């Protein structure tokens, strides 16, 4: 489940330039997906780190 | 192949004479609006035209017996009313015909200045006037 | 740093709204800060100070300014919320840039939506540009650096 | 835009009041903006932020200024409401113009009526124009562009 | 108008008080305006705006200023009200004049009486004129033009 | 008047306190004014205005300033009230003078007593005179002219 | 006086604290004033004024400023009160001096103790002296002259 | 002193946070002051003054400013409190320095933690440095000198 | 081994003539940002570059019969629109070829100034123009 | 027994030539902090040293064919980065050796000014530069 959702979220960056201004946007998006899963109780750990 | 000189000219202002000693202030001016958005690669601004301005016009002449034309025009001011006139200024050729013409819309007098008197003042008494207006067009064909 | 960076070179990007280059350019950005609400208590016998306790983390609204743009996608999004109560929150990135135009530092703004839209007064006697202003509410932000 | 437009060239038109050219010319227009009232809530266990919810869309009054005109149709309309409580709301259009004097963008102001009318103080020792000011209440506006 | 009038030429006249030329001349006049008090209501199901309703028409006090005059009839009238609670309301006319010294427009002020009287502070180290100020309450006004 | 008088030539005199020439000279005088408190009422069916009614006449305190004088009789009088609650009200006359040093107009201040006394701050780095200030409460005043 | 004295030459002395010459020198002194609290009453039938009655005499805190001194006795006294709630009130004399450096006039400040102590902000980009400020509460004062 | 010290040369050090030279340098420091809360009481028969009593000692927050630093240890500490409610108080020393770069005087700040963090607004049309600001709450301070 | 003189030059501005009497204002300028942290051993500030500026350019020429090029360019301003041009200024050698070139981006005219007239004005009538622009590059190879 | 003259000197700035027409701005300045306590017998203030300042340095030279050293240094500015240099200015003796030396730390160029062109400008075209810096030391042994 988690892999399919992330895969779809990253389709919007497929034809973007491959540089720092894209790498940072991809990271922010993935982290937002995962923080929600953590709050929901799927992921283990006291804090996101 | 030669430029024009600056001493042969005439002024039509609705008075009885067209000869003047000095004419100045025939200028045009536009304001500038500047802009820069934070993401621009250049660290300077882009410029475009704003609103427009005009300068006041100054006319100088010698004082003559029984000629009170400047005062009489000034004295037409009555609260917010004044006689407005079309002012035509022209640079002349050797046949005394126009070459370069400055056309001025809606002029009226802002101030009238008299001469100063001196015991040893061995010179001509010169009076002057300053005019407000609403626009200038330059013709040179 | 040894020589700290200046503040006049930055980029605003939106996620969930169709991109156009004219919606990424802004005159000014403000509101990237935070505070903690506290409460006080006096303990009998302790006369040197009162105790203070944290309660909540608080964030201000994000404010963006620019010259008026007539075909903006961001404004169409604002209108759906303003006129019909259709709300669909977005994420946003604020980037502070270096001389190679790459990020020095960024801010990740989470779950934002429009609360305000205005255009400054017209004046027949002044030479000025028409300026537009947009304000957004959001839940929190994180930083990457 | 690439070069954003200036704000000094515009037109105000009224629907439901006899037209005269002297009632379409104004010195200044203000009040074309909007905001959303919200409420806050604290959820137990969530210590990162408070929740915020929208409640209502809000608009300010529209304000118009010009030099004093003695035979205005708009003022006759204002007087009927002010003096006799006869109210008959009108619609209005605000137009921002381009160099061909055609609209860049317009605002559609819906169901407006007069709430204020005044003239600025007289002063025997100052050279000034007499200025008139009119304020209108309305329900909402839409934009066309 | 095409060229709007200026505001520095005007006349104040009183009805019910013996006339003197020195009581018709003033440095400044203010307070010729009006407003409408309103109330708000939220209708369930309508989320685009709140309703607004008129309640009352409201007028500010009329304020007059001039240099100190010692034998004024207007001041004797003010004193009877101030010192003995003898009140006898008057009517008043404010005239804005043209270049022939005839009215452009006038204001009819109805049923006025004195509520305030003062003279500005004295200062041994400044070169200034002694200035007097009078404020009147009234019911309403009408205009003629 | 035709040419109104200036405000820089005046005299303050006290009744009930031993006279000294140095207690009649002041830098500034203020507080010679009055106002009327009112109440409002809305009458059902009358929508053009609210009614207003007078209730009371009101006067501000009288304020006097001068350079510091060490042997003043007025200050000894102020101290008896300030330090011991011994109150003994006085009357006072304020005179506005003409070029022959005779009164143009006077004010009769009735039943006054001290409520305040102060001296302005000292500053080692500024060149200034030490200034004293006295404030008095009174019941009413009358004018003679 | 005929020529009133200036305010830039004065001395502050303390009783109950070990003396040092560096604790008698100050940049500025303020707070030497007093006022009387009053109450109002309306008597039925009397419409010319309201009655006013005195209740209490009131004094402000005394404020002293100077450049920072590290070994001050006055500050050690302030610290005992601030840190441990050990309070031991002192008396104080403020002297305004003449050209022979003798008092023109003095103020006797009775039963004073510390309520505040601070030092102004540091700024790496400005050329300024570090300034210290002390505020004292007291019961009353008397004057000698 | 005979010549008091200036305020532009100082050092801020932290205890409990890994040291880096770039976290000891600041543009400005403020908040090193204190006050005492009091209460009032009126005693019947005593009309010269009201009594005042101390209740509590009070301190303001400590405020630090500098140019933006991206790898700061102090900011990482602030984030743990801001984002996760993990609080771990620290001690701090403020040093005012002499010409040999040794302390003239120091302040011992006890048990501090972060309550605020912000960065000033960006502006595309101005030449400015990005400035960061941090505010800390603490219990009390002591001085050494 | 010798420096260049300053009197032989030409200006390409989109008009019909390239001869001018006077050219001035070819400047470049940068702002300075200053900083000092309280713990520094030095009691002065450190400096770094800020945003950039450009000066306006002034051109002067003699008035000629049937030449109204200055007015016509100025008169292309229409609210926020104007004809923008590339301005090239060049210092020439003895073969009348470029040596030093100043390249100016996006220029338009801010103001046009006419001459003053005098009865005893035994001189040439000189008109002038002031131009706004967005950037300058200097080439000397 | 005689003072030094002011016309024989050289400047080392990292460029290809050390000859200049004019050098100015080699100044040092300190601020003053004033104080007076109310009890003092004197009615004037006591003074002590504050923070320090430095002036900008101006250099002037003639324009030469294929020498674009001033522009190239200026053009190293990139947002907040610039090439900084050590500037050494020296007054020379009859053997062309240093006598008095001014040592300048961290200089960079603030502005570059080009020449003005004139039809009757019978003179040398002179360019100039203004430099920012962080400190000056004077050596005279």
What is the phi-psi region of residue C58: left when phi exceeds 0, alpha when psi lies from -120 to 50, beta otherwise?
beta
Q: Which chains touch J (3 or more CB pairs under 8 A)?
A: C, F, G, H, I
Contacts of F83 in chain G (CB under 8 A): 57, 142
Q: In whole angstroms, give the CA distance from residue H66 to residue G122.
A: 13
Q: Which two tokens stand for residue B87?
A: 């002012």
In angstroms, what CA-CA distances link D136 with D31, D60, D69, E37, F25?
10, 9, 18, 13, 57
Q: Which two tokens stand for residue D88?
A: 């008959």
In chain H, whose CA is at the least distance from the CA of J50? H6
Q: Is C7 on the interface with H (CB under 8 A)?
A: yes
| Nearest residue to J127 via CA among I4, I105, I137, I55 | I4
Which residue has tokens 């500053």? F123
Mutation target among D96, D99, D102 for the I interface, most CBs of I within 10 A: D99
- As a dihedral over the C-alpha atoms of residue D86, residue D88, residue D94, residue D95, rounded to 10 degrees, the angle is -120
Size of interface C-H (CB pairs under 8 A): 96
Mutation target among E54, E62, E122, E142 for the F interface, most CBs of F within 10 A: E122
Q: Which H or E run includes B46?
A: strand B46-54
Q: Is G34 on the interface with H (CB under 8 A)?
A: no
Strand ranges inside D9-144, DSSP E = 10-15, 28-30, 33-41, 51-58, 62-67, 90-97, 103-119, 122-123, 131-137, 140-144
- Three state DSSP letters for G68-130: CCCCCHHHHHHHHHHHHCCCCCEEEEEEEECCCCCEEEEEEEEEEEEEEEEECCEECCCCCEC
Q: Do E85 and E1 form a contact (C-beta atoms < 8 A)?
A: no
In chain A, whose CA is at the least distance from the CA of C14? A25
Q: Do J75 and J22 form a contact (C-beta atoms < 8 A)?
A: no
F145 Cα to chain J: minimum distance (Å): 49
Q: In whole angstroms, give the CA distance from residue G107 to residue B63.
A: 76
**Contact state of H4 with J35 under an 8 Å Cβ cutoff:** yes
**Contact state of I40 with H127 under an 8 Å Cβ cutoff:** no
Q: Do A38 and A45 form a contact (C-beta atoms < 8 A)?
A: yes
What does chain D come to in residues? 145
Q: In whole angstroms, give the CA distance from residue E57 to residue E34.
A: 7
Angle at H90 between CA H88 and CA H96, to 5 degrees: 160
Mutation target among B32, B37, B43, B45 for the C interface, most CBs of C within 10 A: B37
DSSP 8-state assignment for residue C42: P
D102 Cα to chain C: minimum distance (Å): 15
Q: In whole angstroms, give the CA distance from residue H8 to residue H27.
A: 9
Nearest to I38 among H27, H126, H128 (CB): H27
**Contact state of B50 with D6 under an 8 Å Cβ cutoff:** yes
Q: Which residues pair with I46 in a beta bridge?
A: I35
Q: What share of chain G is helix, strand, coil (3-state, %, to 5)?
A: 10, 50, 40
Angle at F68 between CA F64 and CA F74, to 5 degrees: 55
I38 Cα to chain G: minimum distance (Å): 4
**Contact state of B35 with D3 under an 8 Å Cβ cutoff:** yes
Strand ranges inside I55-132, DSSP E = 57-62, 85-92, 98-113, 117-118, 126-132
Q: Which two tokens stand for residue C44?
A: 């009998």
**Contact state of B35 with D8 under an 8 Å Cβ cutoff:** no
In this structure, the number of other CB atoms found within 10 A of the CB of residue D80 comes to 13
Q: In whole angstroms, give the CA distance from residue B124 to residue D115.
A: 65
Nearest to C8 among H56, H87, H124 (CB): H124
In chain H, whose CA is at the least distance from the CA of J47? H3
Secondary structure (DSSP) of F8-68: S-EEEEEESS---GGGS--SEEE--EEEEEEEEEPPTT--S--EEEEEEEE-PPEEEEEE-
Q: In whole angstroms, give the CA distance from residue G4 to residue F10.
A: 20
I61 Cα to chain G: minimum distance (Å): 50
End-to-end CA distance of chain I: 16
Q: Which residues pair with F118 in a beta bridge?
A: F133, G33
Q: In whole angstroms, give the CA distance from residue H32 to residue H112.
A: 13
Q: Do D110 and D141 form a contact (C-beta atoms < 8 A)?
A: yes
In angstroms, what CA-CA distances link H20 with B114, H24, H72, H81, H112?
78, 7, 8, 20, 19
Nearest to H5 among G82, G120, G130 (CB): G130
| Nearest residue to H61 via CA among H141, H6, H132, H143 | H141
Q: Which two tokens stand for residue B140?
A: 């040179």
- Contacts (Cβ under 8 Å, ≥6 apart) of C86: C80
Q: Which H or E run includes J138?
A: strand J136-139
In angstroms, what CA-CA distances link J114 with E22, H131, I30, I138, J126?
70, 36, 15, 10, 7
In this structure, the number of other CB atoms found within 10 A of the CB of residue J9 comes to 18
Q: Do B23 and I117 form a contact (C-beta atoms < 8 A)?
A: yes
Q: In whole angstroms, give the CA distance from residue G106 to residue C59.
A: 56
Q: Which chains touch E (3 or more CB pairs under 8 A)?
A: B, D, F
Residues of E with CB under 8 A from a CB of B: 3, 5-6, 9, 98-99
| Nearest residue to B28 via CA among I70, E14, I7 | I70
Nearest to B44 among I52, I79, I122 (CB): I52
Q: In whole angstroms, give the CA distance from residue E37 to residue D87.
A: 14
How many CA atoms lie less than 13 Å away from C61 in the CB half-sphere?
A: 15
Strands E103-119, F33-41: parallel, antiparallel or unpaired by DSSP? antiparallel
Q: In whole angstroms, give the CA distance from residue I56 to residue I107.
A: 9
PDB experimental method: cryo-EM
Angle at H127 between CA C144 and CA G120, to 5 degrees: 85
Q: In whole angstroms, give the CA distance from residue F142 to residue F110.
A: 8
**Contact state of J51 with H3 under an 8 Å Cβ cutoff:** no
Residues of C with CB under 8 A from a CB of I: 3-4, 6, 8
Q: Which residues pair with F107 in a beta bridge?
A: F94, F143
H66 phi/psi in degrees, rounded to 5: -165, 170
Which residue has tokens 């103020």? G107
Q: Is J26 on the interface with H (CB under 8 A)?
A: no
C138 Cα to chain I: minimum distance (Å): 33
B42 Cα to chain D: minimum distance (Å): 15
Give the three-class secondary structure for J140. Answer: coil
Q: Do C5 and C62 form a contact (C-beta atoms < 8 A)?
A: no
| Nearest residue to J102 via CA among J116, J117, J90 | J90
Q: Which H or E run includes E108?
A: strand E103-119
Q: Which residues pair with H28 in a beta bridge?
A: G123, H65
What is the phi-psi region of residue C95: left when phi exceeds 0, alpha when psi lies from -120 to 50, beta otherwise?
beta
Q: Do H60 and H7 form a contact (C-beta atoms < 8 A)?
A: no
| Nearest residue to C90 via CA among C64, C111, C60 | C111
Contacts of C95 in chain A (CB under 8 A): 21, 24
- Cα C38 to its chain centre, rounded Å, is 24
Does chain D reach chain B with at least 3 CB pairs under 8 Å?
yes
Q: Do E121 and E53 form a contact (C-beta atoms < 8 A)?
A: no
Contacts of H10 in chain G (CB under 8 A): 122, 124
- Contacts (Cβ under 8 Å, ≥6 apart) of E25: E12, E66
Angle at C135 between CA C129 and CA C137, to 5 degrees: 170
How many CA atoms lie less than 13 Å away from D34 in the CB half-sphere?
A: 24
| Nearest residue to C119 via CA among C74, C80, C65 | C65
Q: In whole angstroms, give the CA distance from residue J106 to residue E95.
A: 73
Burial class of residue D2 (count of CB atoms within 10 Å of its CB; 0-12, 13-18, 19+): exposed
Q: Which two tokens stand for residue I37?
A: 């942290």
Nearest to H8 among I33, I38, I51 (CB): I38
Secondary structure (DSSP) of C69-135: -SS-HHHHHHHHHHHH-----EEEEEEEE-TTS-EEEEEEEEEEEEEEEEEPPEETTS--B-EEEEE
**Contact state of C108 with A21 under an 8 Å Cβ cutoff:** no
- Three state DSSP letters for B11-45: EECCCCCCCCCEEECCEEEEEEEEECCCCCCCCCC
Q: In whole angstroms, give the CA distance from residue F119 to residue F121.
A: 7
**Contact state of C3 with J80 under an 8 Å Cβ cutoff:** yes
Q: Which H or E run includes A34?
A: helix A20-39
């Amino acid at each position: 489940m988690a892999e399919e959702s992330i895969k779809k979220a990253t389709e919007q960056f497929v034809f973007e330039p491959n540089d720092g201004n894209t790498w940072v946007r991809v990271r922010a998006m993935i982290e937002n997906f995962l923080i929600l899963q953590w709050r929901a109780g799927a992921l283990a750990g006291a804090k996101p780190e | 192949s030669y430029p024009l000189s600056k001493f042969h000219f005439s002024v039509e202002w609705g008075g009885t004479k067209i000869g003047f000693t000095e004419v100045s202030g025939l200028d045009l001016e536009t304001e500038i609006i500047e802009y820069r958005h934070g993401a621009s690669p250049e660290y300077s601004k882009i410029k475009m035209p704003g609103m427009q301005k005009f300068s006041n016009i100054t006319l100088k002449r010698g004082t003559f017996k029984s000629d009170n034309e400047y005062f009489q025009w000034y004295n037409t001011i009555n609260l917010n009313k004044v006689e407005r006139r079309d002012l035509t200024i022209s640079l002349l050729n050797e046949e005394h015909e126009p070459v370069v013409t400055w056309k001025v819309k809606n002029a009226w007098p802002l101030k009238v200045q008299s001469t100063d008197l001196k015991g040893d003042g061995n010179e001509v008494a010169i009076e002057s006037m300053e005019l407000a207006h609403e626009g200038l067009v330059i013709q040179n064909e | 740093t040894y020589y700290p960076p200046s503040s006049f070179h930055f980029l605003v990007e939106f996620t969930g709204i169709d991109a156009k280059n004219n919606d990424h350019e802004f005159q000014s950005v403000s509101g990237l800060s935070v505070d903690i609400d506290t409460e006080e208590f006096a303990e009998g016998g302790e006369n040197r100070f009162k105790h203070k306790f944290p309660v909540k983390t608080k964030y201000p609204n994000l404010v963006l300014k620019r010259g008026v743009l007539v075909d903006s996608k961001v404004i169409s999004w604002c209108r759906d919320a303003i006129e019909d109560f259709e709300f669909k929150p977005i994420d946003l990135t604020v980037k502070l840039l270096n001389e190679e135009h790459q990020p020095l530092m960024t801010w990740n703004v989470v779950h934002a939506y429009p609360v305000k839209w205005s255009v400054e007064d017209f004046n027949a006697q002044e030479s000025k540009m028409a300026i537009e202003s947009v304000e957004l509410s959001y839940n929190y932000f994180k930083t990457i650096v």
